[PDB]
Design an enzyme around this catalytic site. Structure first.
Site, PDB file in Angstrom:
ATOM      1  N   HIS A   5       0.801  -1.217   0.000  1.00 49.79           N
ATOM      2  CA  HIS A   5       0.000   0.000   0.000  1.00 49.79           C
ATOM      3  C   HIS A   5       0.829   1.260   0.000  1.00 49.79           C
ATOM      4  O   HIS A   5       0.444   2.260  -0.615  1.00 49.79           O
ATOM      5  CB  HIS A   5      -0.962   0.041   1.165  1.00 49.79           C
ATOM      6  CG  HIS A   5      -2.146  -0.838   0.973  1.00 49.79           C
ATOM      7  ND1 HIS A   5      -3.395  -0.517   1.448  1.00 49.79           N
ATOM      8  CD2 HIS A   5      -2.274  -2.027   0.333  1.00 49.79           C
ATOM      9  CE1 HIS A   5      -4.260  -1.454   1.079  1.00 49.79           C
ATOM     10  NE2 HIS A   5      -3.607  -2.384   0.408  1.00 49.79           N
ATOM     11  N   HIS A  61      -1.216 -12.331  -2.736  1.00 56.04           N
ATOM     12  CA  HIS A  61      -2.279 -13.074  -2.083  1.00 56.04           C
ATOM     13  C   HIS A  61      -1.937 -14.519  -1.805  1.00 56.04           C
ATOM     14  O   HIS A  61      -2.813 -15.312  -1.434  1.00 56.04           O
ATOM     15  CB  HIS A  61      -3.595 -12.901  -2.849  1.00 56.04           C
ATOM     16  CG  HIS A  61      -4.147 -11.524  -2.727  1.00 56.04           C
ATOM     17  ND1 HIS A  61      -5.260 -11.097  -3.411  1.00 56.04           N
ATOM     18  CD2 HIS A  61      -3.738 -10.473  -1.976  1.00 56.04           C
ATOM     19  CE1 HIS A  61      -5.510  -9.839  -3.090  1.00 56.04           C
ATOM     20  NE2 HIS A  61      -4.590  -9.435  -2.239  1.00 56.04           N
TER      21      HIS A  61
END
Ligand code: HEM
Ligand code: HEM
EC number: 1.11.1.21
Lengths: 735, 735
Positions: free
Chosen positions: B92, B265
């Site tokens: 992020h 992920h």
């Protein structure tokens, strides 16, 4: 569409939704990031005082006087003389001052930036500033815009037959809008712009003495009051009550108020030749073609006989370019009737009077006498009427009062006499200058300073905590907006400061007695050397900081600049100093805020007035806590087991995640720090403490000082900030 | 309640109606007043590169690795390992980057400030940052927050079985919110926050490639796309289209995109255990007790099994703390059904699959396979599906792509490789690093510089105007947000820059041929001294400035820093460099604004990217005009009769009130200056020229340079600014 939003949403140069849009209640550090040296085109090291003292001051005044009658075709001079316009420019520059917070005034030359450049009351003063620009162009950095706007007014008076007391330069220019001033919360300008400051009251006589503090104008965008009457209601008696209120808020009494208005309105005229619908955007809203000007008037050439500024068309005297007593003569001797100006505004015209008031562009046209509602105020209040009648009879008393009040107006935010420059500084010292005496004796030297530091620290009842606390309490009265306050004068020992609750008067008295003992032991024992109580207060704190650093393992020189003097009570006006009394003090954990100014907001505001950067504010608070320098000696914020040692323990403990912080009181002012492992309450903190671990930019700085190994940097940074704050008012010292 | 307005209106610390409220369309200079040295608590002196190079780098990594499995009671670690959370934190931090404008990215550590600290997609990363703070506290100024956030992610991957290519430090910290970034114009966050960026289209497939430029996220407050699908519509195919668009705007292609998502992920899980009504304000809105954290969850202790971040409750793999190919195996082999998370969000679950997905807090509980809509996107697009299927069979190919893409993600805004610090900088040179070669031959000395200056100033096809224009054209490609561009590399001589319209390619080609002749005559006739074209371009403009100053009557040494190298076309990707092409360049009076950005706003934006202050921007523009350095050689803005001499004539003539300025073009871009006495058209100007006589703060600076006697100051200020701009990319000199 909507207030404060541009219809076109820019995607460059800061365009887009911003952090303050999302979280508008969050504390902002903007006011601590203004006026930075890198933004100053003259350089952060430019010395304006040195520059002005090399200025050919007499030539400047001669050039201004010449310019007064050199009519420029783009803005022709009324009666061939810009004197009135220039007086208005100067009065409007100085006229924004509010005595309570010390903001506004002419001292930063802020009329040339937003928002003041575009306030309705400053309409067409863009033309005035542009007319005097050639003087600035000629003389360069040796005269600031701030000094020039005011000197031009002063020179204009003198060249229209009114001898002033003199003048002092010394206002360094500023280079961005001052967005730290609270001008009000209204989202409209006059004729609206005042629901908030009267708390929605519209009863104009009843509400007059209820204007929101610290404001000093009756609408957003005005200098003082509405010339048509309160909320445009042409009632002179109610106008008088607004005038007393607004002038009172600017620090002027009844005599000064009448003198200023009757004095100013000897000159020039108002302008309301055409309806306002003919007038284009103010300068901040105008297109590039206007090149910084605004209010373009589309009727004829927009100037000369078509001038439109206030909407009123009043010419006070028969000789608007020459000092006279025509204003009071007309005011008192005429009978007045309510009429409309050509722009549709309320004003007053003489009934059955003489038709000999001259037209500004036609020597053959004449008008009847006219007055504003706000002029008629002066004969519709018992005290203003008495004063006006006295001065009708004795115009020499008006001239004396006006010279004094005009000098006050122009210099009220200039600071102590030591800041005043030039060859015609008035010799009289006035109470509003917070006068100081010339110094007693030969200045103490380095060896004397070392001996006094050791004397202070070994004196009974003085310890590091009390010394640092006392020095800071003195220092933080300084405010850079009007250059008032600070340690010089030792006014902490005088009324009202010695009785301020925030100074812990009973403690302060013992500390001052101790320092006065040090003073008595020293003076008369070192030849012609004498030390002031002011220097001892500062030296005491400074010795305390030095000792606290040494106790923390850091040997550092803590600079001290001698030479402060002690003021007398007679030199220290209780009302004027009452304005410096804090309601909350974050450096010493005193007090608290209120709904409209949280504790931490008050702290940042005070920091801006001390010229502190965010790192300087942060390091000072953290060091004051380590020193145990709270006003009452409490442990609030004192997150250290080594109180009196200069360590960054405040920050280290604040950011320790094993401490959980929760509110104790209802009002959110008190906080408890609990050890999450033991469940015992370890610390008590205030909002001034905890903001440094909440606000993301302040916390980033708290982190720096909480880093392992930063004991030494913390000390160095603290000492630098301490030095800065202690010396803020040292205008007596050059370079 | 009103957007962007606090319910309570503060009257301190900047409270009250502000200039930007009254005149929200006025150009703001805010972006040129950020990141000032005085605001940096480390000091303006601080050399982060030196500090970092002294860091015990291996020890920091060892401590980070240890932290990962040391669960803290106040925010318990999923599966006993913070790795996933830390990877998300780094992702992020880096993931806001937009290739077009080069803003966002992790290079300034801006996640720790507003607004990023409080974007919904960064929910609970406040906890992640707080968890790593003890590392920062241990190592102090030798690791920046900017570097630490990313290094933590990198170390996390490596400690969960995924060897990266390595890592480069070198990101100095910043100390305030960067309010120069255009994140969008919407006044809401996700789940809304996107009416503007899709121009009110809700056709989710058709609109996907019409996302507002230069934005790279599908809602305000998101990193890239909505995990529930476009506008929360759980349609994987439409999600794919959003992902290609957003990732493409972040400079990632299909292979890179699948690698990053399937790579990321592999690790950790999402959190959606309780409904959003249980969640308190984000950090910027939270009370002081939260001490910089936010999103307080009132269910239980708010953490562990009750963690609520996105509202989704997905665990992608059966080993969330260890690299695997389980993401792709699940994604492709399972049959997916749409279900609701406990918080009420759409996600996908495997229908009659294995029940062996581990619970983060109970070793005895297992769940079914789950996926986000944005994960199913990767098998609901033909190109993504082919990649996914290949990597299911050839996991080594995913590992390779992910290593490369993760490195690119983290370092894409770090600049030239000369900026990269530490012992594990990858050796491979990547195209997105805008690589530069080693120098040829020996560095020219001052004798060589003197000879070259004399040659350059007596060469066919070169003159002062063209040389200054060329050097600035090359210089202004620099942007500080991602440290791309500048004069090093002489990339003006390569595609695409050599054919940019803004570079006047025919004039440029002649200038470059002439400089190459100078280069040929010097190279291979001065033993082994060799000079680059890059150096000759800068030296030529520098020599031209110096001579122009001399011709103006000012003798000044304009410094020159040799050592630039020439890039190859192979290392200069046409697409990579298309991003630097200017819409407008006010320094050379090129171009025009758009519906969303005025010419002068684009100029101030560019100035911010060059780290210029308002005085530096102003002096540079006035000097470029005096030099006749417009991109097309025209007289627009060239308000001088001494073109090529370095005088302040631009300013003196701009502010001459005898010139009246009027629009000529319907587009608002062209202006005429008419002499009001003669009525003759004297000048032609652009918006970039005239803003300096319109904006009050810029005009204040223009006035300084227009003042009598400031010809030397003007030259001195110009030369300093010139030097600063010419050297912005000289990170090799800091190395
Ligand atoms: C209650 C206080 C005051 C009010 C409401 C007031 C109001 C006004 C108004 C409305 C104008 C006309 C502006 C225009 O249309 O051009 C004006 C002009 C003027 N005022 Fe005041 N005034 C006040 C106090 C003062 C003071 C204190 C001074 C100076 C000491 C002053 C000096 C002037 C001068 C010289 C002008 C003439 C401008 C010109 O000739 O262009 N006034 N005043
Ligand atoms: C289309 C792009 C992406 C979307 C929509 C997306 C969405 C999400 C969401 C919604 C979460 C859950 C947040 C929470 O509830 O805790 C998450 C977690 C995560 N994502 Fe992504 N993601 C994307 C790309 C990436 C990339 C590129 C990486 C890394 C290279 C990554 C790594 C992670 C990791 C490690 C977590 C787990 C956090 C934890 O265990 O606490 N994601 N993602």
């Amino acid at each position: 569409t909507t207030f404060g939003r541009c219809a076109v949403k820019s995607n460059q140069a800061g365009g887009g939704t911003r952090s303050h849009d999302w979280w508008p209640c969050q504390l902002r550090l903007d006011v601590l990031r203004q006026f930075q040296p890198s933004q100053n085109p003259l350089g952060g090291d430019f010395d304006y005082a040195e520059a002005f003292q090399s200025l050919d001051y007499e030539a400047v005044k001669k050039d201004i006087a010449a310019l007064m009658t050199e009519s420029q075709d783009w803005w022709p001079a009324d009666f061939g003389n810009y004197g009135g316009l220039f007086v208005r420019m100067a009065w409007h520059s100085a006229g924004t001052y509010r005595a309570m917070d010390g903001r506004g005034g002419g001292g930063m030359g802020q009329q040339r930036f937003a928002p003041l450049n575009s306030w309705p009351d400053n309409q067409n003063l863009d033309k005035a500033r542009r007319l005097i620009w050639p003087i600035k162009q000629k003389y360069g950095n040796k005269i600031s815009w701030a000094d020039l706007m005011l000197l031009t007014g002063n020179v204009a008076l003198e060249n229209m037959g009114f001898k002033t007391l003199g003048f002092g330069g010394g206002r360094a220019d500023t280079w961005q809008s001052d967005e730290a001033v609270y001008w009000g919360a209204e989202t409209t300008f006059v004729p609206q712009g005042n629901d908030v400051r009267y708390n929605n009251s519209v009863d104009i006589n009843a509400r007059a003495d209820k204007l929101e503090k610290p404001l000093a104008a009756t609408h957003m965008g005005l200098i003082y009051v509405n010339p048509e009457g309160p909320n445009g209601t042409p009632d002179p008696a109610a106008s008088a009550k607004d005038i007393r209120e607004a002038f009172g808020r600017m620090g002027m009494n009844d005599t000064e108020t009448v003198a200023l208005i009757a004095g100013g309105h000897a000159f020039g005229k108002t302008h309301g030749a055409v309806k306002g619908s003919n007038i284009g955007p103010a300068p901040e809203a105008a297109d590039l073609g206007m090149q910084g000007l605004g209010w373009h008037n589309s009727v004829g050439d927009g100037n000369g006989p078509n001038q439109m500024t206030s909407g009123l068309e009043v010419i006070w005297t028969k000789t608007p370019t020459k000092w006279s007593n025509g204003y009071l003569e007309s005011l008192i001797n005429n009978n007045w009737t309510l009429v409309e100006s050509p722009a549709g505004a309320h004003q007053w015209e003489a009934v059955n009077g003489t038709v000999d008031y001259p037209d500004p562009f036609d020597k053959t046209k004449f008008r009847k006498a006219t007055m504003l509602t706000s002029d008629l105020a002066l004969i519709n209040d018992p005290e203003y009427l008495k004063i006006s009648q006295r001065w009708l009879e004795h115009p020499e008393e008006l001239a004396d009062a006006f010279a004094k009040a005009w000098f006050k107006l122009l210099h009220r935010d200039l600071g102590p006499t030591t800041r005043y420059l030039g060859p015609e500084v008035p010799k009289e010292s006035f109470i509003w200058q917070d006068p100081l005496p010339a110094r007693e004796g030969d200045l103490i030297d380095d060896a004397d300073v070392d001996k006094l530091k050791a004397a202070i620290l070994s004196t009974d009842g003085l310890d590091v905590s009390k010394l640092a606390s006392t020095a800071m309490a003195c220092a933080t009265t300084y405010r850079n907006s009007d250059k008032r306050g600070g340690c010089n004068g030792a006014r902490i020992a005088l009324e009202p400061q010695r009785n301020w609750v925030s100074n812990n008067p009973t403690q302060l008295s013992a500390v001052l007695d101790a320092l006065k003992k040090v003073q008595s032991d020293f003076n008369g024992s070192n030849g012609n050397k004498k030390v002031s109580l002011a220097d001892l207060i500062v030296l005491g704190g400074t010795a305390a900081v030095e000792k606290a650093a040494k106790d923390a393992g850091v040997d550092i020189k803590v600079p001290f600049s001698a030479g402060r003097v002690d003021a007398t009570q007679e030199q220290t006006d209780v009302t004027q100093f009452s304005y410096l009394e804090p309601q909350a003090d974050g450096f010493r954990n005193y007090g608290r805020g209120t709904a409209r100014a949280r504790t931490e907001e008050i702290m940042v505001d005070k920091a801006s007035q001390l010229t502190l950067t965010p790192p300087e504010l942060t390091v000072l608070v953290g060091g004051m806590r380590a020193l145990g320098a709270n006003y009452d000696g409490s442990d609030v914020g004192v997150f250290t087991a080594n109180k009196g040692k200069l360590t960054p323990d405040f920050f280290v403990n604040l950011v320790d995640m094993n401490i959980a912080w929760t509110a104790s009181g209802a009002d959110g002012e008190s906080w408890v720090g609990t050890d999450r492992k033991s469940r015992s309450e370890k610390y008590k903190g205030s909002r001034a403490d905890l903001v440094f671990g909440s606000h993301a930019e302040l916390r980033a700085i708290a982190e720096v000082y909480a880093e392992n190994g930063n004991q030494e940097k913390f000390v160095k940074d603290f000492v630098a900030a301490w030095t800065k704050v202690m010396n803020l008012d040292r205008f007596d010292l050059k370079v």
